Design an enzyme around this catalytic site. Structure first.
Site, PDB file in Angstrom:
ATOM      1  N   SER A  45       8.234   3.608  -4.166  1.00 17.91           N
ATOM      2  CA  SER A  45       6.679   3.656  -4.281  1.00 17.91           C
ATOM      3  C   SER A  45       6.380   5.308  -4.793  1.00 17.91           C
ATOM      4  CB  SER A  45       6.103   3.372  -3.327  1.00 17.91           C
ATOM      5  OG  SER A  45       5.795   2.008  -3.173  1.00 17.91           O
ATOM      6  N   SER A 105      -0.090   3.019  -0.314  1.00 12.97           N
ATOM      7  CA  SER A 105       1.209   2.322  -1.142  1.00 12.97           C
ATOM      8  C   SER A 105       0.688   0.975  -1.544  1.00 12.97           C
ATOM      9  CB  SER A 105       2.404   2.413  -0.279  1.00 12.97           C
ATOM     10  OG  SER A 105       3.399   2.559  -1.473  1.00 12.97           O
TER      11      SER A 105
HETATM   12  B1  LIG Z   1       6.624   1.504  -2.107  1.00 13.56           B
HETATM   13  O1  LIG Z   1       7.956   1.679  -1.856  1.00 13.56           O
HETATM   14  O2  LIG Z   1       5.876   1.926  -0.802  1.00 13.56           O
HETATM   15  C1  LIG Z   1       6.340  -0.206  -2.129  1.00 13.56           C
HETATM   16  N1  LIG Z   1       7.091  -0.724  -0.978  1.00 13.56           N
HETATM   17  C2  LIG Z   1       7.403  -2.153  -0.748  1.00 13.56           C
HETATM   18  O3  LIG Z   1       6.840  -2.946  -1.713  1.00 13.56           O
HETATM   19  C3  LIG Z   1       8.328  -2.681   0.309  1.00 13.56           C
HETATM   20  N2  LIG Z   1       8.034  -2.647   1.551  1.00 13.56           N
HETATM   21  O4  LIG Z   1       6.684  -2.094   1.554  1.00 13.56           O
HETATM   22  C4  LIG Z   1       6.091  -2.199   3.078  1.00 13.56           C
HETATM   23  C5  LIG Z   1       5.998  -3.876   3.350  1.00 13.56           C
HETATM   24  C6  LIG Z   1       4.796  -1.482   3.240  1.00 13.56           C
HETATM   25  C7  LIG Z   1       7.213  -1.558   3.815  1.00 13.56           C
HETATM   26  O5  LIG Z   1       7.595  -2.309   4.950  1.00 13.56           O
HETATM   27  O6  LIG Z   1       7.758  -0.642   3.543  1.00 13.56           O
HETATM   28  C8  LIG Z   1       9.464  -3.121  -0.089  1.00 13.56           C
HETATM   29  C9  LIG Z   1       9.864  -3.831  -1.607  1.00 13.56           C
HETATM   30  S1  LIG Z   1      11.423  -4.398  -1.276  1.00 13.56           S
HETATM   31  C10 LIG Z   1      11.680  -3.984   0.302  1.00 13.56           C
HETATM   32  N3  LIG Z   1      12.577  -4.167   1.277  1.00 13.56           N
HETATM   33  N4  LIG Z   1      10.467  -3.490   0.906  1.00 13.56           N
END
Ligand SMILES: *[B]([O])([O])[C][N]C(=O)/C(=N\OC([C])([C])C([O])=O)C1=[C]SC([N])=N1
Length: 263
Positions: A45, A105
């Protein structure tokens, strides 16, 4: 050469078991401190900064763009979208989408930014237009977070991202109004207190964007206004060998603390 700060970052990295990338720019003197500065890392992100900035650039020639509604439909929801899900069957403006993407995010919000730019390659094109030859966005959310070792998709280097972030937030890549808006958004991030923020003196002001993904990928990119000196730009990227590794925001805090202690 290897500096004291670089040897401390290597020791941190060794204890962590993963791979750490750091780039500092001190804007007082333009000096840099790099650790794996030219290696690629999955952005996750942190890429949302480039996308939001690209929409801000579009808004320089379209005064009402940020107040433009974007339909949110049930099928647009992805894995994490706490803001957008409240607007399903309704609308959000591009300002609202930018704020949600950056400060919460929200991944649906990021997809709307990407679509406004014509797809991932529109984000890459903006990066190229502001002098970043390294950044690449290849996929949408959520797949841009797969973070597979060795995969070039959706990566950049610490050096390139620090230089971009400086140009966007402190330099003239954006118009003044737009630069100020980006800075306001980053300063209001909700997700950052465990990351770079956690290793710096508390009197300093930070604006940042975190990232998370598979392979325990744990990232943060920050602009920092320290007490008593000109701003800093700091990128800390971290990724691990196991697909289902745990988040390690403490490692980012430790990297930031080493950097601060080396100033
Ligand atoms: B960005 O990198 O902040 C988007 N992040 C995500 O999509 C992932 N997790 O986001 C949440 C659920 C907020 C978290 O727990 O950090 C993600 C994508 S693949 C993965 N293992 N986590």
């Amino acid at each position: 050469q290897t500096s004291a700060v670089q040897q401390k970052l290597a020791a941190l990295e060794k204890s962590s078991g993963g791979r750490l990338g750091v780039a500092l720019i001190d804007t007082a003197d333009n000096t840099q401190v790099l650790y794996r500065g030219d290696e690629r890392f999955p952005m996750c992100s942190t890429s949302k900064v480039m996308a939001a900035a690209a929409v801000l650039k579009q808004s320089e020639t379209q005064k009402q763009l940020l107040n433009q509604p974007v339909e949110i439909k049930p099928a647009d929801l992805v894995n994490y979208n706490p803001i957008a899900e409240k607007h399903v069957n309704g609308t959000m403006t591009l300002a609202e989408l930018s704020a949600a993407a950056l400060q919460y995010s929200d991944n649906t919000a990021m997809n709307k930014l990407i679509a406004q730019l014509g797809g991932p390659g529109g984000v890459t094109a903006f990066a190229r237009a502001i002098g970043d030859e390294t950044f690449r966005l290849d996929r949408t959310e959520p797949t841009l977070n797969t973070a597979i070792p060795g995969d070039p998709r959706d990566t950049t280097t610490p050096r390139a991202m620090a230089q971009t972030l400086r140009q966007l937030t402190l330099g003239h890549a954006l118009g003044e109004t737009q630069r100020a808006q980006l800075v306001t958004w980053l300063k209001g991030n909700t997700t950052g207190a465990a990351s770079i923020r956690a290793g710096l003196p508390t009197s300093w002001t930070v604006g940042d964007k975190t990232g998370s993904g598979d392979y325990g990928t744990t990232n943060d990119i920050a602009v920092i206004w320290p007490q008593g000196r000109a701003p800093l730009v700091l990128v800390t990227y971290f990724t691990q060998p196991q697909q289902n590794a745990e988040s390690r925001r403490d490692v980012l805090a430790s990297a930031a603390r080493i950097i601060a202690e080396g100033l």
